[PDB]
Design a binder for this molecule. Structure first.
Ligand SMILES: *[C@@H]1O[C@H](CO)[C@@H](O)[C@H](O)[C@H]1NC(C)=O
Ligand SMILES: *[C@@H]1O[C@H](CO)[C@@H](O)[C@H](O)[C@H]1NC(C)=O
Ligand SMILES: *[C@@H]1O[C@H](CO)[C@@H](O)[C@H](O)[C@H]1NC(C)=O
Ligand SMILES: *[C@@H]1O[C@H](CO)[C@@H](O)[C@H](O)[C@H]1NC(C)=O
Length: 435
């Protein structure tokens, strides 16, 4: 079901509508030009920003889901129609960890990275950091597994030493971590994302609630339980077989049009929680943006937000000449980063009441941008057609045209021009409002 090149393509009319719970699927050519390396170009630097792979629910969510399934199985005097499987369903999910499928997604991502950047990877041991979350680190290890598998299979590889994860960035409310959020006091207190999501849930869940209660006499559900039962479609699918070869029976409880609404609920959550919808959303991504500028221009980090000054100004934990960088992070931080970089500056504020498709929103959705195993590639290339280095961003294989600079027909900008456009991040955005 899942491939190195294209990601997850089983039951795609459903599985591509799980927002951040969708397994990565390739968006090559979707509202985009070709992601191929252009004629007479040579990649000179690549930054990878990867999410962890498919996982179990977080321990608090897994507890909530188990409680819901237990309650339904206790209270229902019948399990009717499509809900009949709830009779005998055994909740077996764990918490937090990668599933076998999610491990394999990251092995595949490592292969894919080696394959796409072979000419550089042949001679490069990437410099790798991971935010300090078990599933994120494990994702890094699996990515490395795949990268080495591909490299050791390539007769043209010259520098074959395995990369280690050099930096495990601690996760806490006091540690400045560009790959996770936590230090921006006001933002961490923000409730806008949850409020927007509850509001939109109140619009669409009631009809579903009615139908489910009709099939589960004895059962009372909340709007939240409806969302819980929809979350279970993805979590169960990615856990129930090692290869996610079998769609969860939770999935066909809901119609296609309902999955569109769910996918949108997820997009709203991310947009209003971490993206431009939140007044302090993009500010959470300034830290990494400034790290990326530093890497693209081989220059010391200029940042006063969520970088750690001792991590960044020491060559051991922040080299400026590594040529390949790979960072492992979380959906929420990756959303803030992509917005801080201006990559979704063509996207207007999401309707809080009405579904808008990823294409209506110019390529933005949770499933297009931060699926399980999401990856972004930020390239620098040297082309016979141009004296200046050219920068290109690819998000889950979609060429995302840059903003803030004069972009060419291939969605690229000249390096200095791109950096010039990032004036908001370079000046620390509205970070001061954190306090
Ligand atoms: C920065 O990192 C160093 C080394 O890991 C640590 O001692 C210090 O507490 C960090 N400061 C912040 C605020 O992240
Ligand atoms: C939720 O909807 C109510 C009623 O229409 C509205 O007053 C409120 O502002 C909405 N919440 C958000 C955060 O959009
Ligand atoms: C941690 O971040 C805050 C910026 O929000 C800053 O005041 C402090 O200097 C930082 N400390 C380190 C070690 O970078
Ligand atoms: C994206 O839009 C915001 C709001 O207009 C602006 O402040 C920011 O500089 C833009 N970013 C880029 C890279 O153009």
């Amino acid at each position: 079901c899942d491939t190195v090149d294209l990601g997850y393509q089983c039951s795609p009319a459903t599985s591509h509508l799980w927002g951040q719970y969708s397994p990565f699927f390739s968006l090559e050519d979707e509202l985009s030009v070709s992601s191929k390396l252009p004629k007479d170009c040579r990649i000179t630097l690549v930054q990878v920003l990867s999410r962890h792979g498919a996982r179990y629910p977080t321990s608090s969510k897994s507890k909530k889901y188990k409680k819901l399934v237990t309650a339904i199985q206790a209270n229902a005097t019948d399990f009717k129609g499509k809900f009949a499987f709830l009779k005998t369903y055994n909740y077996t999910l764990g918490a937090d960890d990668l599933t076998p499928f999610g491990e394999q997604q990251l092995v595949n991502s490592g292969i894919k990275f080696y394959q796409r950047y072979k000419a550089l990877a042949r001679s490069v041991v990437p410099f790798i950091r991971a935010s300090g979350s078990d599933r994120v680190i494990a994702s890094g290890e699996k990515f490395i597994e795949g990268f080495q598998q591909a490299k050791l299979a390539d007769p043209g590889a010259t520098n074959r030493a395995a990369p280690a994860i050099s930096v495990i960035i601690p996760e806490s409310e006091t540690f400045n971590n560009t790959l996770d959020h936590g230090v921006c006091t006001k933002f961490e207190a923000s409730q806008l994302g949850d409020e927007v999501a509850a509001n939109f849930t109140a619009l669409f869940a009631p009809d579903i609630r009615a139908r489910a209660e009709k099939h589960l006499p004895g059962v009372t559900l909340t709007d939240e339980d409806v969302v819980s039962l929809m979350d279970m479609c993805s979590f169960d699918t990615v856990a129930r077989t090692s290869d996610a070869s079998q769609l969860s029976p939770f999935c066909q409880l809901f119609t296609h049009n309902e999955w569109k609404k769910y996918n949108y609920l997820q997009s709203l959550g991310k947009y209003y929680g971490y993206g431009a919808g939140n007044p302090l959303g993009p500010a959470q991504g300034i830290g990494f943006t400034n790290e990326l500028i530093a890497r693209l221009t081989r220059s010391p980090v200029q940042d006063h937000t969520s970088t750690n000054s001792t991590l960044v100004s020491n060559p051991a934990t922040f080299p400026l000449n590594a040529t390949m960088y790979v960072d492992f992070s979380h959906d929420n931080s990756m959303v803030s980063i992509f917005f801080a970089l201006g990559l979704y500056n063509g996207t207007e504020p999401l309707s809080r009441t009405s579904v808008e498709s990823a294409k209506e929103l110019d390529g933005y959705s949770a499933s297009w941008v931060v699926p399980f195993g999401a990856r972004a590639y930020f390239e620098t290339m040297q082309c016979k057609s141009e004296k200046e280095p050219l920068v290109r961003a690819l998000i889950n294989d979609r060429v995302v045209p840059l903003h803030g600079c004069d972009v060419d027909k291939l969605g690229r900008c000249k390096l200095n021009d791109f950096v010039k456009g990032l004036s908001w991040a370079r000046s620390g955005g509205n970070w001061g409002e954190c306090f």
